[PDB]
Amino acid sequence: YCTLSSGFTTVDISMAVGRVVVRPSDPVGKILRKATFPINPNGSTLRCTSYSDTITAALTQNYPLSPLGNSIYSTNIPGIGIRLYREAENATNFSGYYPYTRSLTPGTTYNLAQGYFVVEIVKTADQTGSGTLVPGLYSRYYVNGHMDRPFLTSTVYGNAITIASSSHHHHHH
């Protein structure tokens, strides 16, 4: 089982990007935007007693996997997928895509590493929509017994991620 430092505090990442244009000429699979957000740890730590204790990088939107698989999940916008993970500086220490669960090592004091939370916005179908990604919690990174106090969450606030399909612009030739 795992114990948390006194005053353990989740770090929340505000997922936000400038308006993402997606065009008919973009291929399915296009990384329309990879956006990074600094993870600034706050000193929270935890320590566990068993190799059966785990950390989980979980997705929370409960949207179906997109037709592209590879951890690209559908969103509320047609033809637009979202994929989440973490990195350190210079794209090192790739976490692997959310979701995953791994066992921890007993006795090790864990802290959140300085680095980056990553949002990828992906074209998942030929026909793409426009509009505002649905707000709310998108991920939590937590140890067993403490899903209610994650190390790290990521959340969309309000209209922070918008998609513009250029076909919808009705360009006057």
Residue numbers in the entry: 1 to 173
From the paper:
In Abp2DRBD, two 310 helices are present, one at the C-terminus and one between β strands 8 and 9. The C-terminal helix results from the six histidine tag added to this construct for purification. However, the 310 helix between β strands 8 and 9 forms the anterior loop of a large, open depression (>200 Å3) located at the distal end of the RBD relative to the linker to the pilin domain (and by extension, pilus rod). The carboxylic acid residues of the citrate are coordinated by the side chains of the amino acids R86, Y100, R102, and Y141. Y100 and R102 sit on the left-hand ridge of the binding site, while the base is composed of the Y141 side chain, which emanates from a β sheet on the opposite side of the receptor-binding domain core (β strand 13) and R86, situated on β strand 8. The R102 and Y141A mutations reduced binding relative to Abp2DRBD WT by approximately ~70% and ~90%, respectively. The crystal structure of Abp2DRBD shows that K34 forms a salt bridge with E87. Therefore, the K34A salt bridge seen in the Abp2D structure is holding the anterior loop down, keeping the pocket open. Subsequent analysis showed that equilibrium populations of Abp2DRBD skewed toward a larger pocket opening distance, indicating that the anterior binding pocket loop in Abp2DRBD is flexible but predominantly favors a more open conformation.
We identified two virulence pili independently critical to A. baumannii catheter-associated urinary tract infections, the chaperone-usher pathway pili Abp1 and Abp2. Further, their respective tip-adhesive proteins, the adhesins Abp1D and Abp2D, make use of large, distally oriented binding pockets to adhere to glycoproteins like fibrinogen, a wound-healing protein important in CAUTI pathogenesis. We demonstrate that Abp1D and Abp2D RBDs are structurally similar, and each binds fibrinogen and other relevant host glycoproteins important in CAUTI and other infections. These proteins share a common binding mechanism, using a large, distally oriented, and flexible pocket that recognizes a complex glycan receptor.
